[PDB]
Scaffold this motif. Sequence first.
Motif, PDB file in Angstrom:
ATOM      1  N   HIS A 228       0.821  -1.198   0.000  1.00  0.00           N
ATOM      2  CA  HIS A 228       0.000   0.000   0.000  1.00  0.00           C
ATOM      3  C   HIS A 228       0.863   1.258   0.000  1.00  0.00           C
ATOM      4  O   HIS A 228       2.067   1.222   0.263  1.00  0.00           O
ATOM      5  CB  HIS A 228      -0.937   0.011   1.204  1.00  0.00           C
ATOM      6  CG  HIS A 228      -2.017  -1.023   1.140  1.00  0.00           C
ATOM      7  ND1 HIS A 228      -3.196  -0.908   1.843  1.00  0.00           N
ATOM      8  CD2 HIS A 228      -2.095  -2.192   0.462  1.00  0.00           C
ATOM      9  CE1 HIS A 228      -3.955  -1.962   1.600  1.00  0.00           C
ATOM     10  NE2 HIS A 228      -3.310  -2.756   0.765  1.00  0.00           N
TER      11      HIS A 228
ATOM     12  N   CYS B 182      -6.543   1.662   5.009  1.00  0.00           N
ATOM     13  CA  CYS B 182      -7.200   0.382   5.210  1.00  0.00           C
ATOM     14  C   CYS B 182      -6.905  -0.161   6.606  1.00  0.00           C
ATOM     15  O   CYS B 182      -6.209   0.458   7.413  1.00  0.00           O
ATOM     16  CB  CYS B 182      -6.773  -0.611   4.131  1.00  0.00           C
ATOM     17  SG  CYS B 182      -4.989  -0.843   3.990  1.00  0.00           S
TER      18      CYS B 182
ATOM     19  N   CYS C  18      -3.225  -0.690   7.117  1.00  0.00           N
ATOM     20  CA  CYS C  18      -2.402   0.511   7.099  1.00  0.00           C
ATOM     21  C   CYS C  18      -2.549   1.342   8.363  1.00  0.00           C
ATOM     22  O   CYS C  18      -1.567   1.933   8.821  1.00  0.00           O
ATOM     23  CB  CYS C  18      -2.753   1.374   5.886  1.00  0.00           C
ATOM     24  SG  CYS C  18      -2.166   0.714   4.324  1.00  0.00           S
TER      25      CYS C  18
HETATM   26 ZN   LIG Z   1      -3.889   0.768   2.775  1.00  0.00          ZN
END
Ligand SMILES: [Zn+2]
Lengths: 393, 393, 393, 393
Positions: free
Chosen positions: A315, A343, A346
């Motif tokens: 990511h 997310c 993350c």
């Molecule tokens: Zn992410």
Amino acid sequence: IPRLSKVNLFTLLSLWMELFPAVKRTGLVVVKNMKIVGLHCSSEDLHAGQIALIKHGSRLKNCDLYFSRKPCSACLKMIVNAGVNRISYWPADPEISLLTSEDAKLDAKAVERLKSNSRAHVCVLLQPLVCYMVQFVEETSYKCDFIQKITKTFYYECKQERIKEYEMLFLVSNEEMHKQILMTIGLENLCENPYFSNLRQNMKDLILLLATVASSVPNFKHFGFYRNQSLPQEIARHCMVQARLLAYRTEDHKTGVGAVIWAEGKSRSCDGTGAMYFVGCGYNAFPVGSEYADFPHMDDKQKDREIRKFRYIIHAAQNALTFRCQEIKPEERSMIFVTKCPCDECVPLIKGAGIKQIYAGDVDVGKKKADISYMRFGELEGVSKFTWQLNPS
Amino acid sequence: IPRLSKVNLFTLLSLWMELFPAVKRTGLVVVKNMKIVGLHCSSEDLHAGQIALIKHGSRLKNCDLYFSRKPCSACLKMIVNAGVNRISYWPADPEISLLTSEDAKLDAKAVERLKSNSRAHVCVLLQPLVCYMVQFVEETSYKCDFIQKITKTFYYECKQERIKEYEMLFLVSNEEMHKQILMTIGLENLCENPYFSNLRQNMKDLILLLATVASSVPNFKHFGFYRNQSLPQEIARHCMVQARLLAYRTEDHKTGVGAVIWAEGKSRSCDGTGAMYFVGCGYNAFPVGSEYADFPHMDDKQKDREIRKFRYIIHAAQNALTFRCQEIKPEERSMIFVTKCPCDECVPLIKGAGIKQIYAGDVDVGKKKADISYMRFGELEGVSKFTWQLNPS
Amino acid sequence: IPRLSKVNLFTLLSLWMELFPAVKRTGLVVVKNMKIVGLHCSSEDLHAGQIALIKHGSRLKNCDLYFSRKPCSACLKMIVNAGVNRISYWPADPEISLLTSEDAKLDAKAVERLKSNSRAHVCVLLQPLVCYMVQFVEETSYKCDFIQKITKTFYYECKQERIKEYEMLFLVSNEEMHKQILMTIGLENLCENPYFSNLRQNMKDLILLLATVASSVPNFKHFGFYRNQSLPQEIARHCMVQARLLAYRTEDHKTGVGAVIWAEGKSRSCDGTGAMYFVGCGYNAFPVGSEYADFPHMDDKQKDREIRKFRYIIHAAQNALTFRCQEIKPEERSMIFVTKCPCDECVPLIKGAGIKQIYAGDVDVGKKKADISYMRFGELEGVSKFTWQLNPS
Amino acid sequence: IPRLSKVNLFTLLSLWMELFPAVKRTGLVVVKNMKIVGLHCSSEDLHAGQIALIKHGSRLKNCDLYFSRKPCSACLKMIVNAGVNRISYWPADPEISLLTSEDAKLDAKAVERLKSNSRAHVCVLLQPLVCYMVQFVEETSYKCDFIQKITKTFYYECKQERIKEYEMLFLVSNEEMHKQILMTIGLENLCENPYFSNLRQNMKDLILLLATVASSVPNFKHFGFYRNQSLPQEIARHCMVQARLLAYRTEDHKTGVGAVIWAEGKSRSCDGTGAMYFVGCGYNAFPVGSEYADFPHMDDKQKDREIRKFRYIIHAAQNALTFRCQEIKPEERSMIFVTKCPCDECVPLIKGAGIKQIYAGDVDVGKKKADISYMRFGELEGVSKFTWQLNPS
Ligand SMILES: [Zn+2]
Ligand SMILES: Cc1cn([C@H]2C[C@H](O)[C@@H](COP(=O)(O)OP(=O)(O)OP(=O)(O)O)O2)c(=O)nc1N
Ligand SMILES: Cc1cn([C@H]2C[C@H](O)[C@@H](COP(=O)(O)OP(=O)(O)OP(=O)(O)O)O2)c(=O)nc1N
Ligand SMILES: Cc1cn([C@H]2C[C@H](O)[C@@H](COP(=O)(O)OP(=O)(O)OP(=O)(O)O)O2)c(=O)nc1N
Ligand SMILES: Cc1cn([C@H]2C[C@H](O)[C@@H](COP(=O)(O)OP(=O)(O)OP(=O)(O)O)O2)c(=O)nc1N
Ligand SMILES: [Zn+2]
Ligand SMILES: [Zn+2]
Ligand SMILES: [Zn+2]
Ligand SMILES: [Zn+2]
Ligand SMILES: [Zn+2]
Ligand SMILES: [Zn+2]
Ligand SMILES: [Zn+2]
């Protein structure tokens, strides 16, 4: 989807750094091993090259420096003394303005002599864009989190205004003036057609792309990052545009996500960015060293979860934290700007890294898909969260 | 003008090496530091990978190997033992044919297991061409020295015949058969649309370009290289097509020139090329490490001779001699195939290098321009010269 | 004793290579890792740079090339493409003579552009000698084997003749002409005093040293190398002067010994040296990486044999064999030129290396000291021996 | 099965090279990147170190040299000048014998002074063997192709004779004499117990292993290599013992196979091996860079052919050809000595490499297993084959 090239991304980022909210102002991108290790702007006291020297020192060895204007002889001599590899510059009015004259011309001659007698390669690295790049950038900018958030609660007019302003700032409309500039700065090889017209067209295309991306996060009505003190809205918008520009380096076939980590120092620095200094940057991509067919690119439509891209894509925030050029200082305020909502894999990484603030679009907040979820961002504690929205007060 | 990419050039060269005039035959390109250090073909005794091992040994360390078919487990284990970096392969029927079955499938599984547990990266590196690349290649192939030489004394019929033959040899027409092949060779990520269709389209485009280039030097009437014994016309045509393929890597903006140096050994060799072995290759380009605007690109139309490209362009023969992987042996017969007539600065270098034969197009022979001349080729002594023409006997 | 610097050794050797017995002739020294890997001269067909390209190829990567004249644009572009590091040149009339003019000036401008747009550093690296260097060289040249051998059976007259000839050949006596040359070849920084006079004085001192060393092995009466076919006396004298120039790089505190290994090829070569090619070179020194006080420097006068330099000094022939750039080929004739008689430690090494001929001094033959002896040279079998003496026939 | 260490392999090979069939004789192993690049023996004219210098030159840079005796000061200074990394030696009587003495002691002091003031690491690197290593070597030596071939048509008597001879040649039975030797050669740290006894025991164990391996290919009755002219039986036995020693470096869990490629030059060389020179060596192992569990280790007993080791094991001849330090010369006679019968994937590689002769055991000739076969060796054409057998004539 079309992909921005590395050198074009760095050129655009240097041009955008020249516009950072505060002899001509210069933006500068310092890259090492194809990773951005510095984002600098000229201040009222020091030039971008001098600031880069102060900030890095001998760490500039084997670095690629992308300037928004051709650096002066004082900057260039110290930059090549530090041992950089390449100095790419935007072939417009240099740092010592040639549109003001004898001193500027003498400085340009000195720069040429420095270039001729140094191992550092002073050049213009901007490349032509693919024919679909600008149209695709416009399409994705209209469909980005911030423009859609504004629409639910105009974009073409802001794009036109930014086009006019950035064409005024970064381009030389008069062809004879630009030819004189290119002759003075030792770019005589690009002063005759078709190379002159090709260079001007590439510069205009890059300026159109920059205006498009900058308009994707617009100064519109009372729209800004809200919901521990927030940054000034101008700096937040500038960093979000940095992240949006990085989002166009995406290795993904559907959606590009960009992330920039900045930090606010306690004491004032020499940079034109003020106490704020660049920490890291990233976009969504596969692990470094992967081929086109190394990892699956299929989205959730794939009938097999094993062949879905989600378990192998790195990511934007993960890449920004992985390739950070600075350490996150617990005492300092630190900000991460991410184009999409972070997310569920993350947000814990951002919290653990000690990042104090997340500026993000909140279009996907609360969504729970099979492979990627957004439940943790809404319930996140210990990290200030700022989203694009009307000023609530 | 559009430019062929390095990986696409190597893939095309490996596919063309599979067609060198003499389990399926495999062509192989060995590249070190983005320079071709070997061109091999499978023989009736040994595979291309085994031949490369015999020919190079430890010199395969950190090399990129481009195979026309996926190498077998016996070849792959030795190749990764030698320490290569990348194994790019053409995703058609592998070396152990899957269209014949249990032994081939077991070999494919063993190849996958070798790939999973080695530092070497086994992959498919063919990438899409520019949309104009095939049209430009066709345009330049019709305007090449050999097609024009035949015209003064048909090309599209030969192109269609080569298209049919090379599509039969290098592509899998049945989509289900190709899907089974890709599943067996561990390319499941490319078995579903749009990746399956994209891969097949890229392969078809590369095959079309290869057929175009091969037809640019056609087996037509009694045309061949004539005017100390000449090579068989098949090998001469194959080497000239190698040079024509290299000509599409040109850094020049107008004309691409390619050159391949081969040598004929005295004793028997293990290669499928026979006693003949690849010595060097090159194309017209600027000195290595030059940017787009580092050197002038203007032709003779420029009113200033200082800003003309001619004094800074490295010729195809000069590049072939500079980056040769072998030494020119005075006792051995040595041949250089060059798409255009060698110039007055290339002929002395070829003669001094000890190259015995020059196979070339003679369209520009006798021309004396301001910056480049062709007078020395016609009056050259000590080097056999073979040009495209009707068989004079 | 004063010591010659590496860069001045290479400059002197390139100027001497220009005088190798067979647009102006150019000598060239190719150095890799401070070791000489090539000695070339311009031929009737090819320039020194083109010859070096043919001989080395991509092996010129990171190499230092010392030219007796500034190479032309055709040579410089190929040398830069090959990837060299430094191009030092002697700042006299360049390869394309400026004393003949528009074409030469255009070539000089092209050379300047190539230098300014390449990673290679084109420069003038000759540096001043110590004030005693020329006097010491004269003293040792009068007291060398080849002058004392004649004296027992004039030297300053030959020295004056060589001074006149080499000042005519390598220097530009007219100051205005030299200033014009330096302006044309982009050395304007050295056109103003005291830099102009300093450069001319350094060049004159280097020419005086070269004439001194050359006259130390003179074309005098019928003296030559005699006592399986001998080389032409001119080539033997030239190689002996090469070894004598090397002898001034000695790490020894008393006596400098030099050695050059050359070989004659079977087939014709592109070099201006003919079939003869440089194999190796060396001087007496301590093992590489040793400090000033790492090893004893005392001669036999030391009362302890442990603290005598002889157990630790690497001889000139041993260094020439150690750092040879070519393999000794059994079929080819190979010659080693040594300023002193080879010792009992070097003769077996020379014989084992397969060197066919030794051209040596005769002064120390038969001497038997405590640490170093010369008994094996006289009784040496299987190697032709040529000593300085009157022609027996 | 226990594995021989790399350093113990090199020490044993240097000791065995000292016994190559033709101041004390010295064997020498030159290793680069853990690969053997030279096998040398002292001649009547030149020492092993001088021979290595002649044969390699500056290629000895960063090389590890394993000497059967401590090299003299003349050898050590040249070896250090060549830039080697490590000089391991067998701590017996050095090259200049101390059992003859003032000159020998002075040479030892000079060697110590050279070691003290050089970056090269002069040391004794022999390691203790595992307690089962000698027993396992004896077990596999009795069950090797040659001993079994003799048995079908004594081994311990030859083992005892070799033990006595090699203990006499390589060990110092008198403890006081060995203590004096170790004091003289600067090994005072190993002169008092338990280090003295431990060193002597390790040396005795290594000599026992060497005698075992040498006796496994015995000078017994009229057994030799027979069935284009064969080598002298002594040299063939020496090379086969080299291959047997390399067979104990096997990564295989069941059977170790070794291979040595030697070549006979046309002209006599400086080496004590005569015209014969070492080309390559190898043992059966998994591809370089593999861990213990990277690849399957199962024999044919495993039901699943995918998890059988045969598709991933690199054979001894394949490794010898891969990491060869020399090129196979078509004109020269070349021999490969393999401890087992070459398989059907090794014979084509040996033939394609141009190896003229295969000296091998013939126990497995004609065996056809599921994964490995031996049918091609019997019908091999164009390569002389010599197997262990009673002399037919
Ligand atoms: Zn992410
Ligand atoms: C949340 C997040 C994602 N990414 C990456 C993951 C994917 O590589 C791509 C989005 O691709 P995705 O997962 O298919 O998301 P979509 O919007 O297309 O999904 P949809 O509309 O069908 O629900 O960005 C990122 O770098 N940083 C983040 N913080
Ligand atoms: C002869 C020759 C040339 N080259 C290169 C030099 C230029 O970089 C390009 C041609 O470029 P050019 O000279 O502008 O084009 P033409 O000649 O077609 O000129 P025209 O007849 O249209 O006026 O090939 C080469 O690599 N090897 C050769 N042996
Ligand atoms: C024979 C020989 C020697 N050398 C070196 C090693 C010596 O160490 C040094 C001279 O040093 P030297 O021996 O003290 O000097 P002399 O002999 O002139 O002494 P003298 O007769 O006045 O007492 O050259 C060499 O490189 N190549 C050779 N072939
Ligand atoms: C023929 C051959 C083999 N090798 C290696 C690869 C095998 O993997 C290993 C023995 O391993 P193997 O095959 O399980 O053992 P055997 O054959 O003794 O089996 P057996 O008859 O007891 O069932 O040697 C080699 O390096 N060079 C060769 N030329
Ligand atoms: Zn500045
Ligand atoms: Zn294969
Ligand atoms: Zn040319
Ligand atoms: Zn030239
Ligand atoms: Zn000597
Ligand atoms: Zn010795
Ligand atoms: Zn085998």
